[PDB]
Write an enzyme that holds these catalytic residues in place. Structure first.
Site, PDB file in Angstrom:
ATOM      1  N   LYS A  71       0.824  -1.203   0.000  1.00  0.00           N
ATOM      2  CA  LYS A  71       0.000   0.000   0.000  1.00  0.00           C
ATOM      3  C   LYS A  71       0.862   1.259   0.000  1.00  0.00           C
ATOM      4  O   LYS A  71       0.347   2.375  -0.059  1.00  0.00           O
ATOM      5  CB  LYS A  71      -0.940   0.006   1.208  1.00  0.00           C
ATOM      6  N   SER A 126      -4.709 -12.569   2.585  1.00  0.00           N
ATOM      7  CA  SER A 126      -4.612 -12.271   1.163  1.00  0.00           C
ATOM      8  C   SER A 126      -3.394 -12.980   0.501  1.00  0.00           C
ATOM      9  O   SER A 126      -3.496 -13.481  -0.625  1.00  0.00           O
ATOM     10  CB  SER A 126      -4.607 -10.744   0.964  1.00  0.00           C
TER      11      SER A 126
HETATM   12  C1  LIG Z   1      -4.433  -3.433  -0.702  1.00  0.00           C
HETATM   13  C2  LIG Z   1      -4.309  -4.926  -0.991  1.00  0.00           C
HETATM   14  C3  LIG Z   1      -4.557  -5.933  -1.932  1.00  0.00           C
HETATM   15  C4  LIG Z   1      -5.040  -5.625  -3.331  1.00  0.00           C
HETATM   16  O1  LIG Z   1      -4.327  -4.579  -3.943  1.00  0.00           O
HETATM   17  P1  LIG Z   1      -5.083  -3.663  -5.031  1.00  0.00           P
HETATM   18  O2  LIG Z   1      -4.037  -3.060  -5.933  1.00  0.00           O
HETATM   19  O3  LIG Z   1      -5.868  -2.609  -4.282  1.00  0.00           O
HETATM   20  O4  LIG Z   1      -6.077  -4.460  -5.856  1.00  0.00           O
HETATM   21  C5  LIG Z   1      -4.396  -7.266  -1.600  1.00  0.00           C
HETATM   22  N1  LIG Z   1      -3.979  -7.625  -0.347  1.00  0.00           N
HETATM   23  C6  LIG Z   1      -3.730  -6.657   0.595  1.00  0.00           C
HETATM   24  C7  LIG Z   1      -3.269  -7.066   1.967  1.00  0.00           C
HETATM   25  C8  LIG Z   1      -3.886  -5.317   0.274  1.00  0.00           C
HETATM   26  O5  LIG Z   1      -3.550  -4.343   1.195  1.00  0.00           O
END
Ligand SMILES: *Cc1c(COP(=O)(O)O)cnc(C)c1O
Ligand SMILES: *Cc1c(COP(=O)(O)O)cnc(C)c1O
Lengths: 317, 321
Positions: free
Chosen positions: B44, B267
């Site tokens: 991020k 994620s």
């Molecule tokens: C922000 C994010 C994503 C996805 O990234 P994007 O570019 O917004 O699609 C996936 N996993 C985590 C932990 C994230 O912070």
């Protein structure tokens, strides 16, 4: 053929230096900080942990899947050891007092280390005894001994110090670092001296627990720093002196580092920076390049005193 | 290198590493991009830098003068607070009062101002509240992460090129979770401009498979599946959007820590599940599959990721010495 690392352990080391620009107002010297948050475990520990386990493998002492590694430790050496044990496939048994941080214990378990919590009433002496009892009663067991294993000092001599010498193009005049095991300051200290003997090396320790300056051991908040005795591997002679920093000042500086430099760092990083700034304000150091270390990422300490005000200000709203 | 001048110079240029334990014997190469190596330990930091820098350069904002407002929490809030502290902007983040206390304390530590909103209005309430603030504050500017093309652009300019360079042009497939869609779109467009044969897959939660025609719903894949199609998200660049259940993503994340030494979030787990799923297919045997671990797992100590471990730890008793 590619820059893809074969192993997670290759992400260890080779960490960046950064200048501080805001907090250094009114300093005749330049201060740069080595960012150990950029490691698989987000702390300096990853270096000694790899080095001790790897050294023991090369000397043919331990075998994965057959040796039980045992260590009385917690707090970011425990996390790194658990991490290494996971990667290389050793059973890792860690002894600690039951009053040990719940967040550290959960983290070490996430890597599969077995935790043995010893009676609280017996403190550290309890966990050390426990670990020695287990070493003697476990068939293929080995203890690392971070406070006396020279591979701890050696890793900083071969990786931490050379990285600092290369990145500053030989310009580092002064190196400051908190003492825990004493490995970092001793290994970086010896390496820098062997390149330029005029490099001044300083240790840092808590005012509230100043055993290397002759004080008595006592509770303090500079996590990772100040175990309350002199480690065998600590090299007293390479240092000009051991500077003292209060928990209060280290805490305050850690908060400021986040607000003004965007460096979310722990109390130890705080203390090092306080020590560096005050060396940097001495007339004789005008124009000099002082290097120190930020030994770990600040988010690890969310339930410590470092975020005390923020934590309760946020509860009330 | 030499010493860096600003912490922001530590953004990007993250390493790739092969997985060899969770991947036996799936028959393909899997390499994972480690975004934990960022100043705020998440991917991020890229978008946050690009969006603020973009606005400065088009002269829409000025430090000391402009108030930046954003309806976000999570990794993007932390990254936004981090980039404001650094460049010197007052930063306002609106979020539901139920948001995690730890994320809030972290955003506060960088100096962002937080405004909490009605637990019943969910995301809409924070967005509505943010727009009121925007209209009622002189010299205010909202970043708009889901509809700002600077988000996609940073992954087109950094993340993608890094993957192409580090694999020496050998990447065959790239898999990545969709939150805003910036990463998958930006990397996708880049890689495909270098080799049109490259296959790009997105990933979303089973419990909220909106990009596949399902209905929005509660899921545990933090950072992923925002419940609608973000504007910047380029559907045409993907072969398809794989769905991964929360249970599976969670299990994968735990297994990544235990066997590979990678302490990552849910994620990261979801992405790794999808990557392994592609490895099962006949046309993908022998291919180089690249995916991403977007953050460090220690950030989620209070989530379902660590739940079993927290209970087991609560129940450990001391032994005699
Ligand atoms: C922000 C994010 C994503 C996805 O990234 P994007 O570019 O917004 O699609 C996936 N996993 C985590 C932990 C994230 O912070
Ligand atoms: C280990 C540690 C230190 C001290 O390093 P040593 O080489 O053990 O002397 C300082 N700060 C933190 C956070 C540490 O983990």
């Amino acid at each position: 053929s590619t820059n893809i690392k074969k192993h997670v352990s290759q992400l260890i080391g080779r960490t960046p230096l950064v200048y501080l620009n805001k907090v250094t107002e009114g300093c005749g010297a330049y201060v740069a900080v080595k960012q150990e948050m950029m490691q698989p475990t987000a702390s300096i520990k990853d270096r000694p942990a790899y080095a001790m386990i790897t050294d023991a493998e090369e000397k043919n002492l331990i075998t994965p899947g057959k040796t039980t590694l045992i260590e009385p430790t917690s707090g970011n050496m425990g996390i790194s050891m658990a991490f290494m044990a996971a990667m290389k496939g050793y059973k890792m048994v860690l002894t600690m007092p039951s009053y040990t941080s719940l967040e550290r214990r959960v983290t070490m378990r996430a890597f599969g280390a077995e935790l043995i919590l010893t009676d609280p009433a017996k403190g550290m002496g309890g966990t050390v005894k426990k670990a020695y009892e287990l070493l003697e009663n476990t068939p293929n067991a080995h203890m690392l001994q971070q406070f006396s294993n020279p591979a701890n000092t050696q890793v900083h001599f071969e990786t931490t110090g050379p990285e600092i010498w290369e990145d500053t193009n030989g310009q580092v005049d002064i190196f400051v670092m908190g003492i825990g095991s004493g490995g970092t300051v001793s290994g970086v200290g010896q390496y820098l001296k062997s390149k330029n003997p005029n490099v001044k090396i300083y240790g840092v320790e808590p005012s509230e627990s100043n055993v290397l300056n002759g004080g008595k051991p006592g509770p303090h908040h500079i996590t990772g720093n100040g175990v309350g005795f002199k480690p065998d591997i600590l090299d007293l002679d390479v240092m000009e002196k051991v500077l003292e920093v209060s928990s209060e000042d280290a805490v305050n500086m850690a908060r400021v580092l986040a607000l003004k430099e965007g460096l979310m760092v722990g109390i130890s990083s705080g203390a090092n920076t306080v020590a560096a700034l005050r060396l940097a304000q001495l007339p004789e150091n005008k124009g000099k390049l002082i290097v120190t270390v930020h030994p770990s990422f600040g988010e690890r300490y969310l339930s410590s005193v470092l975020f005390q005000e923020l934590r309760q200000e946020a509860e009330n709203m």
